[PDB]
Design an enzyme around this catalytic site. Structure first.
Site, PDB file in Angstrom:
ATOM      1  N   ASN A  41      -7.474   8.323  -6.727  1.00  0.00           N
ATOM      2  CA  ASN A  41      -8.272   7.346  -7.373  1.00  0.00           C
ATOM      3  C   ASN A  41      -8.790   7.813  -8.606  1.00  0.00           C
ATOM      4  O   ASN A  41      -9.134   8.973  -8.520  1.00  0.00           O
ATOM      5  CB  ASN A  41      -9.170   6.456  -6.528  1.00  0.00           C
ATOM      6  CG  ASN A  41      -8.595   5.993  -5.099  1.00  0.00           C
ATOM      7  OD1 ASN A  41      -7.681   5.165  -5.358  1.00  0.00           O
ATOM      8  ND2 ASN A  41      -9.160   5.987  -4.083  1.00  0.00           N
ATOM      9  N   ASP A  70     -12.218   7.735  -9.481  1.00  0.00           N
ATOM     10  CA  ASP A  70     -13.221   8.467  -8.983  1.00  0.00           C
ATOM     11  C   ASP A  70     -13.286   9.729  -8.339  1.00  0.00           C
ATOM     12  O   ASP A  70     -14.039  10.168  -7.688  1.00  0.00           O
ATOM     13  CB  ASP A  70     -14.323   7.350  -8.296  1.00  0.00           C
ATOM     14  CG  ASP A  70     -13.603   7.103  -6.781  1.00  0.00           C
ATOM     15  OD1 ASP A  70     -12.690   7.614  -6.619  1.00  0.00           O
ATOM     16  OD2 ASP A  70     -14.227   6.218  -5.886  1.00  0.00           O
ATOM     17  N   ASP A  84      -6.710   7.832  -1.392  1.00  0.00           N
ATOM     18  CA  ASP A  84      -6.178   6.726  -0.497  1.00  0.00           C
ATOM     19  C   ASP A  84      -5.157   7.633   0.454  1.00  0.00           C
ATOM     20  O   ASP A  84      -4.334   8.156  -0.010  1.00  0.00           O
ATOM     21  CB  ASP A  84      -5.530   5.678  -1.348  1.00  0.00           C
ATOM     22  CG  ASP A  84      -6.533   4.959  -1.843  1.00  0.00           C
ATOM     23  OD1 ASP A  84      -7.914   4.964  -1.471  1.00  0.00           O
ATOM     24  OD2 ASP A  84      -6.324   4.137  -2.610  1.00  0.00           O
ATOM     25  N   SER A 134     -11.791   9.977  -5.392  1.00  0.00           N
ATOM     26  CA  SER A 134     -11.413   9.952  -3.921  1.00  0.00           C
ATOM     27  C   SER A 134      -9.688   9.656  -3.713  1.00  0.00           C
ATOM     28  O   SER A 134      -9.209   9.821  -4.881  1.00  0.00           O
ATOM     29  CB  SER A 134     -12.094   8.841  -3.339  1.00  0.00           C
ATOM     30  OG  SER A 134     -11.578   7.583  -4.057  1.00  0.00           O
ATOM     31  N   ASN A 190      -9.329   5.009   2.142  1.00  0.00           N
ATOM     32  CA  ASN A 190     -10.093   5.772   1.229  1.00  0.00           C
ATOM     33  C   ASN A 190     -11.066   6.881   1.417  1.00  0.00           C
ATOM     34  O   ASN A 190     -11.607   6.564   2.205  1.00  0.00           O
ATOM     35  CB  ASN A 190     -10.310   4.864   0.249  1.00  0.00           C
ATOM     36  CG  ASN A 190     -11.527   5.257  -0.465  1.00  0.00           C
ATOM     37  OD1 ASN A 190     -12.702   5.353  -0.042  1.00  0.00           O
ATOM     38  ND2 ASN A 190     -11.446   5.629  -1.634  1.00  0.00           N
ATOM     39  N   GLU A 197       0.582  -1.242   0.201  1.00  0.00           N
ATOM     40  CA  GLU A 197       0.047   0.042   0.208  1.00  0.00           C
ATOM     41  C   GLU A 197       0.796   1.210   0.064  1.00  0.00           C
ATOM     42  O   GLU A 197       0.716   2.209  -0.903  1.00  0.00           O
ATOM     43  CB  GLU A 197      -0.937  -0.016   1.185  1.00  0.00           C
ATOM     44  CG  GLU A 197      -2.084  -0.982   1.138  1.00  0.00           C
ATOM     45  CD  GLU A 197      -3.251  -0.723  -0.098  1.00  0.00           C
ATOM     46  OE1 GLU A 197      -2.882   0.097  -0.941  1.00  0.00           O
ATOM     47  OE2 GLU A 197      -3.956  -1.635  -0.276  1.00  0.00           O
TER      48      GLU A 197
END
Length: 129
Positions: free
Chosen positions: A46, A48, A52, A50, A59, A35
């Site tokens: 991301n 969309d 992280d 969003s 998220n 990660e």
């Protein structure tokens, strides 16, 4: 803060992750490796819109507020920036809710693709815990 491998294992252990919902400590360390490379300040946007955040790349769509994710939730009741701290408490507490939500650690796509079915114990091998 960029954690050492064994240093993160110890901090994860102290914050109650070793076998949390049946996931041995090596699972958590492996997930954090892929990660964030153990870097609390890791961020990634991301598709969309969003983002992280943190060592476990939690998220903003569901879990934290960053003020810039239209139509999202904040199920951990925290600013996403709290997931970037050198103190991993917020990341850990939020991960515990995430991993309890029904899909277990499959919530972390990198855990599923890079850790699931592997010798995850290797990630804590040699550590004083």
């Amino acid at each position: 803060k960029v954690f050492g491998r064994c240093e993160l294992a110890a901090a994860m252990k102290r914050h109650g992750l070793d076998n949390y919902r049946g996931y041995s400590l090596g699972n958590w360390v492996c997930a954090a490796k892929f990660e964030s490379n153990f870097n609390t300040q890791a961020t990634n946007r991301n598709t969309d819109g969003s983002t992280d955040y943190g060592i476990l790349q939690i998220n903003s769509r569901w879990w934290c507020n960053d003020g810039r994710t239209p139509g999202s939730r904040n199920l951990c009741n925290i600013p996403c920036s709290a997931l970037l701290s050198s103190d991993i408490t917020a990341s850990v507490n939020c991960a515990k809710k995430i991993v309890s939500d029904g899909n277990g650690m499959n919530a972390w796509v990198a855990w599923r693709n890079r850790c699931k079915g592997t010798d995850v114990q290797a990630w804590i091998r040699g550590c004083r815990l």
